[PDB]
Amino acid sequence: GSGCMPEYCAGQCRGKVSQDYCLKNCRCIR
């Protein structure tokens, strides 16, 4: 995606689904 690097997403957002919301769309899931 755009607006966030993969290392920013996975370094703080848990698991694989919350990471994948950040990778596609730059948000983290509930």
Residue 20 C-alpha from the chain's centroid? 5
Distance separating alpha carbons of residues 3 and 15, to the nearest angstrom: 20
Residue 6 structural domain: 1-30
R_g of the chain, CA atoms, integer Å: 8
Distance separating alpha carbons of residues 2 and 9, to the nearest angstrom: 12
Distance separating alpha carbons of residues 13 and 26, to the nearest angstrom: 11
- The method of structure determination was NMR
Q: What is the DSSP letter of 7?
A: H
Domain count along the chain: 1
